[PDB]
Amino acid sequence: GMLSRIDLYIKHRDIFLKHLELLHKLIEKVEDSSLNESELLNARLVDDMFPFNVQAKIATNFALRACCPEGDIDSFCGLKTYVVTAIDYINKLSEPTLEQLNLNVQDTAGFKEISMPASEYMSSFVLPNFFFHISMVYAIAKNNGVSVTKGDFDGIHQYPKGFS
Amino acid sequence: GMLSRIDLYIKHRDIFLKHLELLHKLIEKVEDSSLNESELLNARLVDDMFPFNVQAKIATNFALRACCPLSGKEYKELEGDIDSFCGLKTYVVTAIDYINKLSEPTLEQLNLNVQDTAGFKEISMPASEYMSSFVLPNFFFHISMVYAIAKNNGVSVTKGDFDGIHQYPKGF
Ligand SMILES: [Cl-]
Ligand SMILES: [Cl-]
Numbered sequence: 001g002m003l004s005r006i007d008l009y010i011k012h013r014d015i016f017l018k019h020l021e022l023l024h025k026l027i028e029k030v031e032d033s034s035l036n037e038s039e040l041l042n043a044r045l046v047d048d049m050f051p052f053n054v055q056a057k058i059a060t061n062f063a064l065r066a067c068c069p070e071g072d073i074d075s076f077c078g079l080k081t082y083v084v085t086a087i088d089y090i091n092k093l094s095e096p097t098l099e100q101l102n103l104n105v106q107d108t109a110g111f112k113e114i115s116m117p118a119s120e121y122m123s124s125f126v127l128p129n130f131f132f133h134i135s136m137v138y139a140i141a142k143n144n145g146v147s148v149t150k151g152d153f154d155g156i157h158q159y160p161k162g163f164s
Numbered sequence: 165g166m167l168s169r170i171d172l173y174i175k176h177r178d179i180f181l182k183h184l185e186l187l188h189k190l191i192e193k194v195e196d197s198s199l200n201e202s203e204l205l206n207a208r209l210v211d212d213m214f215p216f217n218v219q220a221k222i223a224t225n226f227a228l229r230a231c232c233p234l235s236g237k238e239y240k241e242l243e244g245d246i247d248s249f250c251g252l253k254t255y256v257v258t259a260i261d262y263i264n265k266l267s268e269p270t271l272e273q274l275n276l277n278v279q280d281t282a283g284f285k286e287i288s289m290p291a292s293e294y295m296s297s298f299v300l301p302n303f304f305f306h307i308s309m310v311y312a313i314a315k316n317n318g319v320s321v322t323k324g325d326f327d328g329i330h331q332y333p334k335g336f
Pocket of ligand 1: 048049050
Protein backbone atom coordinates (compact mmCIF):
# COMPACT_ATOMS: atom_id res chain seq x y z
CA GLY A 1 0.00 0.00 0.00
CA MET A 2 1.36 3.41 1.16
CA LEU A 3 4.87 2.00 2.07
CA SER A 4 5.46 1.22 -1.64
CA ARG A 5 5.64 5.06 -2.15
CA ILE A 6 9.08 4.92 -0.41
CA ASP A 7 10.17 2.18 -2.91
CA LEU A 8 8.70 4.26 -5.82
CA TYR A 9 10.64 7.33 -4.56
CA ILE A 10 13.98 5.41 -4.21
CA LYS A 11 13.54 3.90 -7.73
CA HIS A 12 12.66 7.24 -9.37
CA ARG A 13 15.29 9.22 -7.32
CA ASP A 14 17.89 6.66 -8.62
CA ILE A 15 16.57 7.17 -12.19
CA PHE A 16 17.00 11.03 -11.85
CA LEU A 17 20.54 10.44 -10.44
CA LYS A 18 21.47 8.01 -13.26
CA HIS A 19 20.22 10.34 -16.04
CA LEU A 20 21.87 13.41 -14.46
CA GLU A 21 25.18 11.43 -14.60
CA LEU A 22 24.49 10.44 -18.27
CA LEU A 23 23.70 14.16 -18.91
CA HIS A 24 27.11 15.12 -17.35
CA LYS A 25 28.81 12.44 -19.57
CA LEU A 26 26.87 13.85 -22.60
CA ILE A 27 28.15 17.45 -21.89
CA GLU A 28 31.75 15.98 -21.70
CA LYS A 29 31.20 14.34 -25.18
CA VAL A 30 29.80 17.67 -26.63
CA GLU A 31 32.89 19.48 -25.08
CA ASP A 32 35.47 17.12 -26.73
CA SER A 33 33.52 17.23 -30.11
CA SER A 34 35.82 20.14 -31.37
CA LEU A 35 32.66 22.30 -31.90
CA ASN A 36 32.27 26.04 -31.01
CA GLU A 37 31.37 26.24 -27.25
CA SER A 38 29.02 29.31 -27.40
CA GLU A 39 27.38 28.15 -30.69
CA LEU A 40 26.57 24.73 -29.10
CA LEU A 41 25.26 26.00 -25.72
CA ASN A 42 22.95 28.48 -27.52
CA ALA A 43 21.83 25.91 -30.20
CA ARG A 44 18.04 25.30 -30.56
CA LEU A 45 15.93 22.72 -32.43
CA VAL A 46 12.66 24.67 -32.64
CA ASP A 47 12.99 28.52 -32.90
CA ASP A 48 10.49 29.17 -30.00
CA MET A 49 12.10 26.41 -27.77
CA PHE A 50 14.92 26.81 -25.16
CA PRO A 51 18.58 26.31 -26.21
CA PHE A 52 20.88 23.38 -25.24
CA ASN A 53 22.27 24.85 -21.97
CA VAL A 54 18.79 26.07 -20.74
CA GLN A 55 17.31 22.58 -21.56
CA ALA A 56 20.13 20.99 -19.41
CA LYS A 57 19.48 23.57 -16.62
CA ILE A 58 15.63 22.91 -16.66
CA ALA A 59 16.14 19.09 -16.61
CA THR A 60 18.55 19.50 -13.63
CA ASN A 61 16.06 21.84 -11.83
CA PHE A 62 13.24 19.31 -12.37
CA ALA A 63 15.41 16.56 -10.66
CA LEU A 64 16.02 18.98 -7.71
CA ARG A 65 12.35 20.03 -7.44
CA ALA A 66 11.35 16.34 -7.24
CA CYS A 67 13.93 15.25 -4.64
CA CYS A 68 14.20 18.26 -2.21
CA PRO A 69 10.58 18.55 -0.78
CA GLU A 70 22.62 29.10 -9.15
CA GLY A 71 25.62 28.89 -11.49
CA ASP A 72 27.16 29.59 -14.88
CA ILE A 73 25.50 27.71 -17.75
CA ASP A 74 27.34 29.81 -20.43
CA SER A 75 30.41 27.47 -20.54
CA PHE A 76 30.86 23.66 -20.63
CA CYS A 77 32.84 23.86 -17.35
CA GLY A 78 30.05 25.80 -15.58
CA LEU A 79 27.20 23.66 -17.00
CA LYS A 80 29.04 20.45 -15.85
CA THR A 81 29.53 22.03 -12.37
CA TYR A 82 25.79 22.89 -12.34
CA VAL A 83 24.85 19.16 -12.99
CA VAL A 84 27.54 17.79 -10.51
CA THR A 85 26.23 20.23 -7.80
CA ALA A 86 22.70 18.73 -8.25
CA ILE A 87 24.02 15.09 -8.25
CA ASP A 88 26.07 15.65 -5.02
CA TYR A 89 23.15 17.46 -3.34
CA ILE A 90 20.61 14.70 -4.23
CA ASN A 91 23.09 11.97 -3.05
CA LYS A 92 23.49 13.75 0.33
CA LEU A 93 19.67 13.52 0.94
CA SER A 94 18.35 10.99 3.49
CA GLU A 95 15.74 8.30 2.65
CA PRO A 96 12.27 9.95 3.02
CA THR A 97 9.64 8.91 5.59
CA LEU A 98 6.13 7.92 4.33
CA GLU A 99 4.86 11.20 5.94
CA GLN A 100 7.24 13.29 3.76
CA LEU A 101 5.96 11.56 0.60
CA ASN A 102 2.32 12.31 1.56
CA LEU A 103 3.02 16.04 2.26
CA ASN A 104 1.50 18.27 -0.41
CA VAL A 105 3.98 20.08 -2.65
CA GLN A 106 2.96 23.51 -3.91
CA ASP A 107 4.24 24.45 -7.38
CA THR A 108 3.08 26.17 -10.62
CA ALA A 109 2.59 24.29 -13.93
CA GLY A 110 2.46 27.10 -16.46
CA PHE A 111 -0.38 29.36 -15.26
CA LYS A 112 -1.90 26.67 -12.95
CA GLU A 113 -1.06 26.55 -9.24
CA ILE A 114 -0.73 22.82 -8.36
CA SER A 115 -0.90 21.01 -5.04
CA MET A 116 0.12 17.32 -5.09
CA PRO A 117 1.43 14.77 -2.55
CA ALA A 118 5.27 14.74 -2.94
CA SER A 119 5.09 11.09 -4.20
CA GLU A 120 2.68 11.95 -7.14
CA TYR A 121 4.51 15.26 -7.65
CA MET A 122 7.77 13.32 -8.39
CA SER A 123 6.39 10.50 -10.53
CA SER A 124 3.39 12.08 -12.31
CA PHE A 125 4.59 15.69 -12.76
CA VAL A 126 8.37 15.89 -12.57
CA LEU A 127 9.42 12.54 -14.16
CA PRO A 128 7.77 13.18 -17.67
CA ASN A 129 8.98 16.87 -17.68
CA PHE A 130 12.50 15.80 -16.65
CA PHE A 131 12.64 13.34 -19.59
CA PHE A 132 11.22 15.94 -22.01
CA HIS A 133 14.12 18.41 -21.38
CA ILE A 134 16.75 15.59 -21.19
CA SER A 135 15.42 14.40 -24.65
CA MET A 136 15.77 17.97 -26.01
CA VAL A 137 19.50 18.08 -24.85
CA TYR A 138 20.20 14.78 -26.74
CA ALA A 139 18.25 15.82 -29.90
CA ILE A 140 20.08 19.25 -30.01
CA ALA A 141 23.46 17.42 -29.58
CA LYS A 142 22.59 14.95 -32.41
CA ASN A 143 21.42 17.90 -34.62
CA ASN A 144 24.85 19.57 -34.19
CA GLY A 145 26.79 16.51 -35.43
CA VAL A 146 27.64 14.99 -31.97
CA SER A 147 28.10 11.17 -32.26
CA VAL A 148 25.31 10.02 -29.91
CA THR A 149 23.35 6.71 -29.74
CA LYS A 150 20.50 5.52 -27.45
CA GLY A 151 23.32 4.15 -25.21
CA ASP A 152 24.40 7.72 -24.32
CA PHE A 153 20.76 8.43 -23.31
CA ASP A 154 19.87 5.33 -21.21
CA GLY A 155 23.19 3.47 -20.58
CA ILE A 156 21.42 0.18 -21.57
CA HIS A 157 21.33 0.29 -25.43
CA GLN A 158 24.60 -0.86 -27.01
CA TYR A 159 25.76 -0.66 -30.62
CA PRO A 160 29.04 -1.68 -32.33
CA LYS A 161 31.67 1.10 -31.98
CA GLY A 162 34.44 2.42 -34.29
CA PHE A 163 38.08 3.54 -33.79
CA SER A 164 40.50 6.48 -34.73
CA GLY B 165 8.80 -6.77 -0.63
CA MET B 166 5.87 -8.45 -2.46
CA LEU B 167 3.46 -5.52 -1.68
CA SER B 168 5.97 -3.15 -3.28
CA ARG B 169 6.15 -5.21 -6.56
CA ILE B 170 2.33 -5.08 -7.11
CA ASP B 171 2.13 -1.28 -6.40
CA LEU B 172 5.18 -0.37 -8.57
CA TYR B 173 3.67 -2.35 -11.53
CA ILE B 174 0.31 -0.48 -11.13
CA LYS B 175 2.00 2.96 -10.92
CA HIS B 176 4.20 2.36 -14.06
CA ARG B 177 1.35 0.82 -16.02
CA ASP B 178 -0.91 3.84 -15.13
CA ILE B 179 1.78 6.32 -16.27
CA PHE B 180 2.07 4.51 -19.68
CA LEU B 181 -1.75 4.49 -19.98
CA LYS B 182 -2.06 8.21 -19.12
CA HIS B 183 0.62 9.29 -21.64
CA LEU B 184 -0.67 6.97 -24.39
CA GLU B 185 -4.08 8.72 -23.93
CA LEU B 186 -2.36 12.16 -24.11
CA LEU B 187 -0.50 10.91 -27.27
CA HIS B 188 -3.88 9.85 -28.78
CA LYS B 189 -5.28 13.36 -27.93
CA LEU B 190 -2.13 14.95 -29.47
CA ILE B 191 -2.62 13.06 -32.82
CA GLU B 192 -6.31 14.30 -32.81
CA LYS B 193 -5.04 17.91 -32.42
CA VAL B 194 -2.41 17.46 -35.25
CA GLU B 195 -5.19 15.97 -37.46
CA ASP B 196 -7.47 19.02 -36.77
CA SER B 197 -4.63 21.53 -37.44
CA SER B 198 -5.51 21.83 -41.25
CA LEU B 199 -1.92 20.71 -42.09
CA ASN B 200 -0.93 18.30 -44.97
CA GLU B 201 -1.45 14.72 -43.56
CA SER B 202 1.51 12.98 -45.35
CA GLU B 203 3.87 15.97 -44.76
CA LEU B 204 3.07 16.09 -40.98
CA LEU B 205 3.40 12.24 -40.50
CA ASN B 206 6.79 12.04 -42.36
CA ALA B 207 8.14 15.22 -40.65
CA ARG B 208 11.49 14.97 -38.80
CA LEU B 209 13.16 17.19 -36.12
CA VAL B 210 16.81 16.00 -36.84
CA ASP B 211 17.65 14.48 -40.32
CA ASP B 212 19.15 11.29 -38.72
CA MET B 213 16.06 10.79 -36.38
CA PHE B 214 12.75 8.92 -37.04
CA PRO B 215 9.70 10.85 -38.40
CA PHE B 216 6.54 11.82 -36.40
CA ASN B 217 4.50 8.65 -37.09
CA VAL B 218 7.48 6.26 -36.40
CA GLN B 219 8.17 8.19 -33.11
CA ALA B 220 4.53 7.59 -32.08
CA LYS B 221 4.80 3.88 -33.09
CA ILE B 222 8.03 3.29 -31.08
CA ALA B 223 6.60 5.07 -27.94
CA THR B 224 3.48 2.84 -28.19
CA ASN B 225 5.63 -0.32 -28.61
CA PHE B 226 7.73 0.65 -25.56
CA ALA B 227 4.47 0.80 -23.46
CA LEU B 228 3.53 -2.70 -24.83
CA ARG B 229 7.07 -4.11 -24.17
CA ALA B 230 6.69 -3.01 -20.50
CA CYS B 231 3.15 -4.42 -20.01
CA CYS B 232 3.02 -7.72 -22.11
CA PRO B 233 5.66 -9.81 -20.07
CA LEU B 234 4.09 -8.71 -16.77
CA SER B 235 0.77 -10.42 -17.70
CA GLY B 236 2.83 -13.44 -18.88
CA LYS B 237 2.57 -12.54 -22.61
CA GLU B 238 5.28 -12.76 -25.31
CA TYR B 239 5.58 -9.24 -26.84
CA LYS B 240 5.09 -8.99 -30.61
CA GLU B 241 5.17 -5.67 -32.47
CA LEU B 242 1.72 -4.15 -32.99
CA GLU B 243 0.91 -4.12 -36.68
CA GLY B 244 -1.14 -1.40 -38.38
CA ASP B 245 -1.25 1.59 -40.68
CA ILE B 246 0.77 4.55 -39.40
CA ASP B 247 0.61 6.38 -42.80
CA SER B 248 -2.73 8.15 -41.99
CA PHE B 249 -4.07 9.99 -38.90
CA CYS B 250 -6.97 7.48 -38.67
CA GLY B 251 -4.58 4.48 -38.72
CA LEU B 252 -2.05 6.03 -36.29
CA LYS B 253 -4.89 6.85 -33.80
CA THR B 254 -6.21 3.26 -34.16
CA TYR B 255 -2.64 2.00 -33.52
CA VAL B 256 -2.46 3.97 -30.15
CA VAL B 257 -6.12 3.12 -29.14
CA THR B 258 -5.38 -0.61 -29.85
CA ALA B 259 -2.42 -0.43 -27.38
CA ILE B 260 -4.47 1.48 -24.71
CA ASP B 261 -7.42 -0.98 -24.90
CA TYR B 262 -5.07 -4.00 -24.91
CA ILE B 263 -3.09 -2.72 -21.83
CA ASN B 264 -6.37 -1.85 -19.96
CA LYS B 265 -7.80 -5.34 -20.59
CA LEU B 266 -4.62 -7.22 -19.48
CA SER B 267 -5.18 -9.53 -16.50
CA GLU B 268 -3.65 -8.41 -13.17
CA PRO B 269 -0.16 -10.09 -13.00
CA THR B 270 0.32 -13.09 -10.72
CA LEU B 271 2.86 -13.07 -7.87
CA GLU B 272 4.97 -15.48 -10.04
CA GLN B 273 4.80 -13.14 -13.12
CA LEU B 274 5.87 -10.15 -10.94
CA ASN B 275 8.86 -12.19 -9.59
CA LEU B 276 10.09 -13.09 -13.08
CA ASN B 277 12.97 -11.30 -14.89
CA VAL B 278 12.10 -9.71 -18.26
CA GLN B 279 14.36 -10.75 -21.20
CA ASP B 280 14.80 -8.25 -24.02
CA THR B 281 17.43 -6.78 -26.38
CA ALA B 282 18.50 -3.09 -26.29
CA GLY B 283 20.23 -2.66 -29.63
CA PHE B 284 22.85 -5.47 -29.62
CA LYS B 285 22.81 -5.84 -25.76
CA GLU B 286 20.75 -8.69 -24.24
CA ILE B 287 19.15 -7.76 -20.90
CA SER B 288 17.49 -9.65 -18.05
CA MET B 289 16.04 -7.40 -15.39
CA PRO B 290 13.31 -7.75 -12.74
CA ALA B 291 9.92 -6.32 -13.70
CA SER B 292 10.34 -3.07 -11.58
CA GLU B 293 13.76 -2.22 -13.12
CA TYR B 294 12.74 -3.22 -16.66
CA MET B 295 9.68 -0.94 -16.61
CA SER B 296 11.14 2.05 -14.73
CA SER B 297 14.85 2.02 -15.73
CA PHE B 298 14.65 0.72 -19.31
CA VAL B 299 11.22 1.30 -20.79
CA LEU B 300 10.05 4.50 -18.99
CA PRO B 301 13.03 6.79 -20.15
CA ASN B 302 12.86 5.40 -23.74
CA PHE B 303 9.03 5.79 -23.76
CA PHE B 304 9.36 9.47 -22.72
CA PHE B 305 12.16 10.08 -25.29
CA HIS B 306 9.93 9.07 -28.27
CA ILE B 307 6.79 10.76 -26.77
CA SER B 308 8.96 13.99 -26.45
CA MET B 309 10.01 13.68 -30.12
CA VAL B 310 6.28 13.47 -31.22
CA TYR B 311 5.50 16.72 -29.29
CA ALA B 312 8.61 18.59 -30.54
CA ILE B 313 7.92 17.59 -34.23
CA ALA B 314 4.25 18.74 -33.86
CA LYS B 315 5.38 22.12 -32.36
CA ASN B 316 8.03 22.50 -35.15
CA ASN B 317 5.28 22.15 -37.80
CA GLY B 318 3.15 24.99 -36.37
CA VAL B 319 0.66 22.79 -34.41
CA SER B 320 -0.69 24.69 -31.34
CA VAL B 321 0.72 22.56 -28.48
CA THR B 322 1.66 23.45 -24.90
CA LYS B 323 3.23 21.44 -22.04
CA GLY B 324 -0.42 20.70 -21.01
CA ASP B 325 -0.82 18.47 -24.10
CA PHE B 326 2.29 16.55 -22.92
CA ASP B 327 1.64 16.04 -19.17
CA GLY B 328 -2.04 17.02 -18.62
CA ILE B 329 -0.98 19.17 -15.62
CA HIS B 330 0.50 22.40 -17.16
CA GLN B 331 -2.16 24.98 -18.10
CA TYR B 332 -1.95 28.10 -20.23
CA PRO B 333 -4.61 30.53 -21.59
CA LYS B 334 -6.74 28.82 -24.28
CA GLY B 335 -7.94 30.15 -27.66
CA PHE B 336 -11.03 32.42 -27.71
CL1 LIG C 1 11.43 24.25 -24.52
CL1 LIG D 1 15.04 8.61 -33.02
